Amino acid sequence: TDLRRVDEVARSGGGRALVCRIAEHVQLDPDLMSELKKVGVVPGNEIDIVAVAGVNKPIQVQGSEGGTQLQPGIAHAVMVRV
Amino acid sequence: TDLRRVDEVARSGGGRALVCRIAEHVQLDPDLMSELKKVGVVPGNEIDIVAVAGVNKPIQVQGSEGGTQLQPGIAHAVMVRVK
Amino acid sequence: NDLIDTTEMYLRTIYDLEEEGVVPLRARIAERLEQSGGTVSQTVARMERDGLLTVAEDRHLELTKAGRARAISVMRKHRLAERLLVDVIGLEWEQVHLEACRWEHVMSEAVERKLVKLLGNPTTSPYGNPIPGLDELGVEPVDTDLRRVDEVARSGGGRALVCRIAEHVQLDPDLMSELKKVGVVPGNEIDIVAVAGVNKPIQVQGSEGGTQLQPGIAHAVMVRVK
Amino acid sequence: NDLIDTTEMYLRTIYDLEEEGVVPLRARIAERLEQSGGTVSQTVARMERDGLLTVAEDRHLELTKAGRARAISVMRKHRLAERLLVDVIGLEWEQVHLEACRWEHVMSEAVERKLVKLLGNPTTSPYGNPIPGLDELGPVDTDLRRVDEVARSGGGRALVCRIAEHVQLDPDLMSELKKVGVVPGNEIDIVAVAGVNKPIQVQGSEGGTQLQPGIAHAVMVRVK
Amino acid sequence: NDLIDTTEMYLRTIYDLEEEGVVPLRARIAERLEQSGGTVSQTVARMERDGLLTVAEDRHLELTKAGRARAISVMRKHRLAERLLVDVIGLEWEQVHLEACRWEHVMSEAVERKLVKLLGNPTTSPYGNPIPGLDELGVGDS
Amino acid sequence: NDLIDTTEMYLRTIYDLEEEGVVPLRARIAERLEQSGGTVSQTVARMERDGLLTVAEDRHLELTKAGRARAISVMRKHRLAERLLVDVIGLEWEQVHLEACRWEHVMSEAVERKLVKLLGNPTTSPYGNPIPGLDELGVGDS
DNA sequence: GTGACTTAGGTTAGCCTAACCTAAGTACG
DNA sequence: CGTACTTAGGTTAGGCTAACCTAAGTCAC
Ligand SMILES: [Co+2]
Ligand SMILES: [Co+2]
Ligand SMILES: [Co+2]
Ligand SMILES: [Co+2]
Ligand SMILES: [Co+2]
Ligand SMILES: [Co+2]
Ligand SMILES: [Co+2]
Ligand SMILES: [Co+2]
């Protein structure tokens, strides 16, 4: 309840957040999981969630080691503490 | 029972007898059943049972229309009323 | 129920479906004999191996010359058994098919020949179905004028004479007791009420009363229209 | 009891029977996996169709190169699983085989390679059985004798070296063997018996027990 | 020769042997039904499991209450079929038994009742063998 | 891809969708497990028959008391397996879930209790997902 | 020796459920 | 005009019991 989904944080105008949960849905894509680890979108790490406008729009995130583009269904399946 | 088996009647010294029962064992040989009908070893008919000596000896019977040789296991499976 | 002979009942089910003008799919055999799709395929495969049937392009089952001959000899035994049970033994009309469906698997050609003489060379079963294979044992009427109760109803209905009740309908003894009560039996006139579209319960009025027939049942009753 | 993978368990049962010096008949697969003769022939036929085994003249089952390779990979997964369960996780000795009999069907080669490093290149299972196919992943035992043959030859003192997969299937027996001290690396005294199909008495360090002929046949020792 | 029903043919074979006054051993069934000794032992074990027969100390087979009842209904059907085949259908005297041996396994008690009335309350088969279990049939809806 | 256990993968898929806050429709299972709509409808009906789930008016799938208990035990095994594969075995971060997705179907509650001790009472998977049903395990003989 | 059973390893027919498929519907918004 | 679901016909793997077989092995007399 205190946790929020990356897609909702982006639509709300973005912000800095602590990565808490990566849902089983995301884990089923190894190539994506490697990318998430590389840029530093992993549990315990802080990310910047870029503000987005609309629906079915890719969510831009900045990790400690770089940035990546999450699809709506992926960003929905990542939970953070703002 | 008052009925007796043809094989036992033969060993006892034979006699005239009324055919009463032909067991299911006999019926399984159609060729034998034809011969039994031909000579007249059929229910309700009288036959003469010839006296026999020993075991495993074929039993000779005389029907109204002739005679036939019954194997011991066949003669055992035919039941008669002795006159 | 126990089929007594699986192979003969598969052959006769294919023959029944052809007589009813139904495409003989393995799904039809599965429904009627109440067996899984896999069981039917496996059993059909054994009969194909034996050379009694083949699977066509649209996957409908076709009888071979040996398969059709065997299917005819079973159906002949069945309908001669039905004649014997009704005419001589006097078994109740609704119970005769179920008895005959077992007897058809044990009757010799020898008994068939004796029954033809005893029953006076019958040409139809007690349900009006022609008796085939009488030539193989040792003038057939043109039946092209006969129409199915469902097609008659879809064409505006009207009065018709009952001629045939298919083996399919005979399997349900309660339905046959109902048909007999209202007088929807071979040699009786019925009034078929008209219906709109397929897959609709068809109303019929007999001499003693009325009843409703399901599409598959109405399809399996053949009549001659006024 | 659920095999998880029928094919892999048929392959491994044939491999077990070879290790035990038992002629791999379909009747052996039937009694061990508790299935009907028809089921075994029907399943053996599917595996012959796939080209994993063949039926010989005397009707004994032979593994093809692909079948042996697959059978080895399963047995390797099984015995690395047993090592992990004993050495790292600490599952009770008598419960380890049953767990490993399921794990052997889901373990990737990737995990096997990681387990080899973690466990320090183990060469035997916790029951003394050699781990095969380690070369494919990336010792002379001809002096070993079976407890039954030793007993039929006058018995004597011997070192327990191997407990076959067959014996591991019975957790109660394995609990008994552990209590009396009939375990790999322990000395036992085998009492002599005449003929065949006779129970075999053995005296361990902590007590004694009787082994059925098929059990004693599946326990390999080195005599004094 | 297809038995149609193995259980019913084992029960009637043991029944036949008792009527002949022969000791009903497994070996007698093996001879008469022309099956291996192992097949007979196996089938007899199934029928013992299903409560149809028991094996005595002298090894002779004994029909249970349930076994004898089933054996009697098969034999009743058999001998009523024989009467129909001879008296009504007119099948040859020597061919009747082989026909009746198949029919006995498919005849309902409903047909049996109709045959009792048709044949004028028969007490014996055409071969003089008494028809057992006639009182078990009843008259149904009559 | 081989599910190893169809029932357990349907239960966990419904469980995953609830955790993601997505409506668990048959169509979601069809997409995620890459099966036809007819297969899903059929398997769901079989699981409804066996009392593992029910279908609501809005047609979303609901786990029964028994369904949820089974789903929780599968998910507990899954996430304890992931912790073992990362922290102990040292399998690569991105390859762990696919391994754990097979292991979850073969792990006993006996092994689970040993993993709790070994891993020092873990509360989350390596991906931060809470481990459910830890109180259900107990300590056995310990 | 003989007849009467037991054992050991098979085969075949005739069934089943679970778990998938393609293809062509209907239902609803 | 898709999205969600049902319908119709079918395949495959993996099981089962019943009812047979051949071929040695055993047992009571
Ligand atoms: Co009919
Ligand atoms: Co039939
Ligand atoms: Co093991
Ligand atoms: Co296994
Ligand atoms: Co007779
Ligand atoms: Co018979
Ligand atoms: Co995961
Ligand atoms: Co899984």
Author numbering:
A (entry chain aa): 149 to 230
B (entry chain dd): 149 to 231
C (entry chain B): 2 to 139, 144 to 231
D (entry chain C): 2 to 139, 146 to 231
E (entry chain A), F (entry chain D): 2 to 143
Which statements did the authors publish about this structure?
The iron-dependent regulator IdeR is the main transcriptional regulator controlling iron homeostasis genes in Actinobacteria, including species from the Corynebacterium, Mycobacterium and Streptomyces genera, as well as the erythromycin-producing bacterium Saccharopolyspora erythraea. IdeR is an OCS from the DtxR (Diphtheria toxin repressor) family of transcriptional regulators which typically consist of three domains: an N-terminal DNA-binding winged helix-turn-helix (wHTH) motif, followed by a dimerization interface that contains most of the metal-binding residues, and a C-terminal SH3-like domain (21–23). The main function of IdeR is to repress the expression of iron uptake genes when the intracellular iron levels are sufficient. When iron levels are sufficient for iron ions to occupy the IdeR metal-binding sites, the regulator is activated and recognizes a highly conserved 19-bp sequence located in the promoter region of its target genes.
As for the IdeRP39G variant, the EMSA results show specific binding to the consensus target, but the affinity is significantly affected by the mutation, resulting in an apparent KD of ∼264 nM. Due to the special structural features of both proline and glycine residues we cannot conclude whether this loss of affinity is caused by the absence of the vdW interactions with the DNA, or if this protein variant is functionally impaired. However, as IdeRP39G is still able to recognize its target and form a stable complex, we can reason that the absence of IdeRWT binding to the Consensus_T3-G3 sequence was not caused by the disruption of the vdW interactions between Pro39 and the thymine in position 3. We also obtained the crystal structure of IdeRP39G bound to the consensus DNA to confirm that no other interactions with the essential thymines of the recognition sequence are formed in this IdeR variant.
